[PDB]
Amino acid sequence: QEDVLAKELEDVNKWGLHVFRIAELSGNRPLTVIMHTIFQERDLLKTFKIPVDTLITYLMTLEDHYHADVAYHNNIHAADVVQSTHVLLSTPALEAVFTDLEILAAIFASAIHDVDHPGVSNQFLINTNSELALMYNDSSVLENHHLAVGFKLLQEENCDIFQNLTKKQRQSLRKMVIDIVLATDMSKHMNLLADLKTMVETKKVTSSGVLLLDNYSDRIQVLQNMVHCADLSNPTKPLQLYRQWTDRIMEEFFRQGDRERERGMEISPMCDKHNASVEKSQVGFIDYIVHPLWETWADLVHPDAQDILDTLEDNREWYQSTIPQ
Ligand SMILES: COc1ccc2ccc(=O)oc2c1CC=C(C)C
Ligand SMILES: [Zn+2]
Ligand SMILES: [Zn+2]
């Protein structure tokens, strides 16, 4: 069924790719095939002299380290964030703003951003005194781990996709990737958003009508927010995709809750299956986190993101209308 897969992959540049269908068609290799497709589209193998076999080996290794038993934070979510970042990077307001190295950083960061996620929160890991919380001194535990695993896997057999980048490129790439993935810790959300707003308030556009970004701080800020948006893009996708995501995160939160209950721990917010309001929580999530983020983003790239914002709003109303009264 190589052809049905290939047809589905033609939508790689569109918001709302059917990533679950691609996961099925590809034999649960959504991250591998989507990354590969994206790297060919953007000509990254040629530009950075990445042997195609090294790329595929790395991708399969990377995908293998997402957990098949985790319902949300798995290779499908990783594939989704990659493809979403890929669309955001193609927004007219950002045309020719970012270098190829910057583009590679954003996409690689998206690919690795949740790798080896155990399906529980930083707080659970801190409360149980896990080795991970210990090694990372309780700070952005999962996120530091995602990075270290992602880079560490480059050392497996025929996995070094950066073998042909100069040392200066590698150092620049590594810095950008690190800055991006640490920004995906939800505890950094408010500060990211605050900085995004500031940038929007003093927004400058170029002669050619694209965003002006003068310095590393402004550049990396946008890339961080871009990937953060991709990470928080579920409520902005067609409703049939959104609802599957919602099912999956709830399943994952509810397993954590069960685990906290059987261990005698305080149950985390939204993790109690006996005490849950899925719909109301989605509305809350939209009102207080997702819509504030996407509206600010939409202002930065005005009017590129208007349809994404409209769908966000249609979807909020759907969940509002589905709250048990
Ligand atoms: C941190 O919170 C997240 C993270 C990722 C997703 C993804 C899809 C989604 O449907 O909601 C998400 C939420 C909010 C969930 C609830 C319980 C309000
Ligand atoms: Zn994460
Ligand atoms: Zn994520």
- Three-point CA angle 196, 13, 145, nearest 5°: 55
Q: Pick the ligand that lies closest to the CA of residue 231.
A: 3
Beta-bridged to residue 320, according to DSSP, are none
Every domain of the chain and the residues it spans: 1-325
User: Are 162 and 129 spatial neighbours (Cβ–Cβ below 8 Å)?
Assistant: no
83 is in an annotated binding site: no
Instruction: Supply the DSSP string of 107-146, one letter for each residue.
Output: HHHHHHTTTT--SS-HHHHHHTT-HHHHHTTTSSHHHHHH
CA-to-CA distance for 19 and 9, rounded, in angstroms? 9
Task: Point out the ligand 1 atom lying closest to the alpha carbon of residue 186.
Answer: 1
Regarding the beta carbon of 253 and ligand 1, being less than 6 Å apart is answered yes
231 is in an annotated binding site: yes
Q: Ligand 2: distance of its center to the CA of 112 in Å?
A: 10
Task: Point out the ligand 1 atom lying closest to the alpha carbon of residue 281.
Answer: 18
Regarding the beta carbon of 186 and ligand 1, being less than 6 Å apart is answered yes
Q: Is the dihedral of CA 265, 144, 221, 217 positive or negative?
A: positive
Closest-CA residue, ligand 1 atom 6, reads 249
Q: Which two tokens stand for residue 199?
A: 């940038």
Q: Ligand 1: distance of its center to the CA of 154 in Å?
A: 30
Closest-CA residue, ligand 1 atom 17, reads 270
Under CATH, which architecture does the 1-325 domain have? Answer: Orthogonal Bundle (1.10)
Say if residue 114 is exposed, middle or buried (CB neighbours under 10 Å; 0-12, 13-18, 19+): buried
Q: Is the dihedral of CA 260, 250, 108, 100 positive or negative?
A: negative
CA-to-CA distance for 250 and 282, rounded, in angstroms? 10
Per the annotation, the verdict on 73 as an active-site residue is yes
Approach to solving: X-ray
Regarding the beta carbon of 246 and ligand 1, being less than 6 Å apart is answered yes
DSSP assignment, residue 117? -
20 is in an annotated binding site: no
Choose which residue among 73, 234, 316 to substitute to test ligand 1 binding: the one with the highest number of ligand atoms within 8 A of its C-beta: 234
- Three-point CA angle 195, 193, 246, nearest 5°: 160
Q: Which residues contact 212 (CB under 8 A, 6 or more apart)?
A: 204, 205, 206
282 is in an annotated binding site: yes
Placement of tokens 């100069």 in the chain:
166
Regarding the beta carbon of 234 and ligand 1, being less than 6 Å apart is answered yes
CA-to-CA distance for 236 and 223, rounded, in angstroms? 19
- Burial code (b: 16+ CB inside 10 Å, e: under 16) for 45-61 equals beebebeeebbbbbbeb
Task: Point out the ligand 1 atom lying closest to the alpha carbon of residue 278.
Answer: 17
What would you report as the CA-atom Rg of the chain, rounded to the nearest whole angstrom?
19
Q: Pick the ligand that lies closest to the CA of residue 122.
A: 2
114 is in an annotated binding site: yes
